């Protein structure tokens, strides 16, 4: 049973992460945030939550939405780092895998800044704290995929995922890295994560893969360099779209073909027939993360909390934008499930 051996190594971790989940903003707290009309009022209301005095070091006039997002995300990062410092064994590997996606983000960010001739220090300061590795600053030396792989990426945990650069090439490399990483993380969950967390993490990683596959299928239509053979190299092989709808999207050239492929799955129909595609994926991710919190002895709670806080920072940043820019008609367009 799940609770029999879980608490030997993860009882404290899971209790702390569930306290973090209790810290997620409820619907009433989001409504109170929405009622704010100034960013100082937003800071005041947000101090009545578990964010607390995270903006106390920021003066009233210096307060910007970018600062609010940066400090909320920093709080997220410190909480994740504390939870990972208490982890050992398979839980430590699980949270390292969680960091591997941010590692891929940092690699793509470094290469994007390098080909754009941005300041090296600025790119390093903008790198995600999660997903940092020691040889990350060395990625500025070259604009060649082979040169960076031999120079840096062969020693990183992203080395298994790689089996001059421009914006489209960096995009392709990043999406290939994501496909390989999602497949590897799915395999790791299948083989090394106990059953309730195994099923929850398989569902969550499959949803993430499906979101990426549908995005790639829909965004390759407006491009000509994305060959149908290249689309196969970008679509992950772990989701509910795999392998049927994944194969259908890897060959589609029109929006109707993509929509017909997505009518295959009962989980994602209506995503393309109404609303915004990204709103559907955000709502589904928050629904899945909310359901993952119904499992008590699952380490998938860490991933669910991480995604819920990322969505929470997105929501708070959107509310900050609909406070700063006026635009109070769109202030309620945030995903909330807690």
């Amino acid at each position: 049973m799940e609770g029999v051996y879980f608490n030997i190594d993860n009882g404290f971790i899971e209790g702390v992460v569930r306290g973090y989940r209790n810290g997620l903003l409820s619907n009433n707290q989001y409504i109170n945030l929405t009622q704010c009309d100034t960013l100082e009022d937003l800071k005041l209301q947000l101090s009545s939550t578990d964010y607390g005095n995270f903006l106390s070091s920021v003066s009233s006039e210096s307060l910007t939405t970018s600062l609010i997002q940066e400090y909320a995300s920093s709080k997220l990062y410190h909480e994740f780092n504390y939870i990972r410092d208490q982890s050992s064994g398979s839980t430590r590997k699980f949270m390292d895998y969680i960091t591997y996606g941010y590692m891929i983000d940092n690699v793509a960010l470094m290469i994007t800044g390098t080909i754009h001739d941005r300041d090296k220090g600025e790119i390093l300061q903008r790198c995600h704290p999660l997903g940092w590795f020691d040889t990350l600053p060395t990625l500025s030396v070259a604009t060649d995929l082979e040169s960076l792989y031999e120079t840096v990426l062969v020693d990183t945990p992203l080395a298994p995922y790689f089996k001059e650069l421009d914006d489209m090439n960096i995009e392709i490399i990043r999406n290939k890295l994501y496909k390989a990483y999602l497949e590897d993380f799915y395999n790791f969950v299948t083989e090394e994560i106990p059953e309730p967390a195994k099923e929850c993490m398989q569902t969550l990683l499959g949803f993430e893969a499906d979101r990426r596959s549908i995005n790639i299928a829909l965004n390759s239509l407006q491009s000509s360099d994305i060959d149908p053979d290249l689309k196969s190299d970008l679509l992950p092989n772990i989701g509910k779209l795999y392998p049927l709808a994944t194969f259908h999207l890897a060959q589609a050239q029109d929006f109707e073909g993509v929509r017909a492929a997505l009518a295959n799955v009962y989980e994602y129909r209506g995503f393309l027939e109404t609303g915004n595609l990204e709103d559907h994926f955000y709502q589904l991710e928050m629904e899945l993360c909310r359901d993952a919190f119904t499992q008590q002895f699952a380490i998938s709670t860490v991933w669910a909390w991480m995604k819920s806080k990322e969505q929470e920072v997105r929501n708070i940043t959107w509310i900050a934008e609909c406070i700063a820019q006026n635009q109070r008609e769109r202030i309620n367009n945030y995903i909330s499930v807690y």
Binding site: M1, G3, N22, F293, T294, Q295, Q296
Partner: protein
């Protein structure tokens, strides 16, 4: 002495008692703990007011009641001064194995169904009847085990 009542038959009678009660407690605990994980999952999302969420836990406990009943009936027939036959010992071992493993299976089914569906019939009362019916179908497995154990106890004593 009597060949049909060797002095080691109480070993099998007491093994029946132990199997009955231990396996019934194991099933009851599986059901109670897994259903309670479901109940806690209901918490901080949809905290109710009236406690219909305790039905899986109550039926898990009824499994331990089945095992208790069979174990008590077996232990009533076990005495160091009475002629306990080897047939009676095997009958009591069968009583214990029957009721205990049936209650273990009932507890597994009750735990699964409770964990998954107590949330879903507290969220929407329409599913209450169906989920309770599935839970009754999980409970009757232990009921069958106890019925067979009762018949076996009667046969072994006579």
């Amino acid at each position: 002495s009597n060949i049909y009542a060797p002095l080691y038959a109480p070993f099998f009678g007491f093994a029946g008692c132990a199997a009955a009660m231990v396996l019934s407690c194991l099933g009851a605990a599986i059901g109670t703990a897994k259903s309670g994980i479901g109940i806690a999952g209901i918490g901080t999302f949809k905290p109710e007011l009236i406690m219909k969420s305790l039905i899986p836990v109550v039926m898990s406990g009824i499994l331990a009641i089945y095992g208790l009943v069979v174990a008590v009936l077996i232990a009533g027939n076990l005495s160091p001064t009475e002629d306990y036959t080897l047939f009676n010992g095997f009958m009591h071992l069968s009583c214990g194995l029957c009721v205990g493993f049936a209650c273990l299976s009932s507890g597994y089914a009750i735990g699964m169904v409770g964990d998954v569906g107590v949330r879903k019939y507290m969220h929407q009362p329409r599913l209450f009847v169906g989920i309770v019916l599935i839970l009754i179908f999980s409970e009757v497995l232990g009921l069958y085990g106890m019925i067979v154990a009762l018949i076996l106890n009667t046969r072994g004593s006579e």
